From Swiss-Prot, chain B:
It comes from Venezuelan equine encephalitis virus (strain TC-83) (VEEV). It is a single-pass type I membrane protein. This is Spike glycoprotein E1. The chain holds residues 813 to 862 of 1254 of the full protein. Class II viral fusion protein. Fusion activity is inactive as long as E1 is bound to E2 in mature virion. After virus attachment to cell receptor LDLRAD3 and endocytosis, acidification of the endosome induce dissociation of E1/E2 heterodimer and concomitant trimerization of the E1 subunits. This E1 trimer is fusion active, and promotes release of viral nucleocapsid in cytoplasm after endosome and viral membrane fusion. Efficient fusion requires the presence of cholesterol and sphingolipid in the target membrane. N-glycosylated. Interacts with spike glycoprotein E2. The precursor of protein E3/E2 and E1 form a heterodimer shortly after synthesis. Processing of the precursor of protein E3/E2 into E2 and E3 results in a heterodimer of the spike glycoproteins E2 and E1. Spike at virion surface are constituted of three E2-E1 heterodimers. After target cell attachment and endocytosis, E1 change conformation to form homotrimers. Interacts with 6K protein. Interacts (via fusion peptide loop) with host LDLRAD3 (via domain LDL-receptor class A 1); this interaction mediates viral entry to the host cell. It is found in: Virion membrane; Host cell membrane.
Curated annotation (Swiss-Prot), chain C:
It is a single-pass type I membrane protein. Plays a role in viral attachment to target host cell, by binding to the cell receptor LDLRAD3. Synthesized as a p62 precursor which is processed by furin at the cell membrane just before virion budding, giving rise to E2-E1 heterodimer. The p62-E1 heterodimer is stable, whereas E2-E1 is unstable and dissociate at low pH. p62 is processed at the last step, presumably to avoid E1 fusion activation before its final export to cell surface. This is Spike glycoprotein E2. It comes from the Viruses. It comes from Venezuelan equine encephalitis virus (strain TC-83) (VEEV).
Length: 49, 50, 53
């Protein structure tokens, strides 16, 4: 849900150590750029997303 | 998470540090030594007097 | 029928590895299999304390 001048927070999942993707939001494309880090667990109890 | 550090052997003075996991919040660690003994293995042989 | 219940295994994690400390009260089957096209299953009867990596 969008307000007029607010800021929307999304959650995503990746395998990229330097992820960079164009985020489509309803008309337009915004670029999301960052640096991901290794997680803390070796073996987890749910499959891959 | 195996974290190794080194503390100087001096009482009274607080020793501070943190642990920076690469994608998480920094975890602060504080150690303040109070009293540091040194107890030898002591073996009585004899007593004496007047 | 009431059936017994073995002790909880002690699972130690590593990079692409699971270790299992197994202390059974009475003999107990450990049945493992991979969730891939080759399951490589392992039907074993463990009666003593045993570590399985």
């Amino acid at each position: 849900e969008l307000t007029e001048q607010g800021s929307a927070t999304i959650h995503f999942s990746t395998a990229n150590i330097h992820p960079e993707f164009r985020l489509q939001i309803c008309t337009s494309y915004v670029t999301c750029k960052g640096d991901c880090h290794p997680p803390k667990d070796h073996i987890v109890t749910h499959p891959q997303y | 998470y195996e974290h190794a550090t080194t503390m100087p052997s001096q009482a009274g003075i607080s020793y501070n540090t943190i642990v920076n996991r690469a994608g998480y919040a920094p975890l602060p660690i504080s150690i303040t030594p109070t009293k540091i003994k040194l107890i030898p293995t002591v073996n009585l042989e004899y007593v004496t007097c007047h | 029928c009431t059936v017994p219940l073995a002790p909880e295994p002690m699972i130690t994690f590593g990079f692409r590895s699971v270790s299992l400390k197994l202390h059974p009260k009475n003999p107990t089957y450990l049945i493992t299999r991979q969730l891939a096209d080759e399951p490589h299953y392992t039907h074993e009867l463990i009666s003593e304390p045993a570590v399985r990596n």
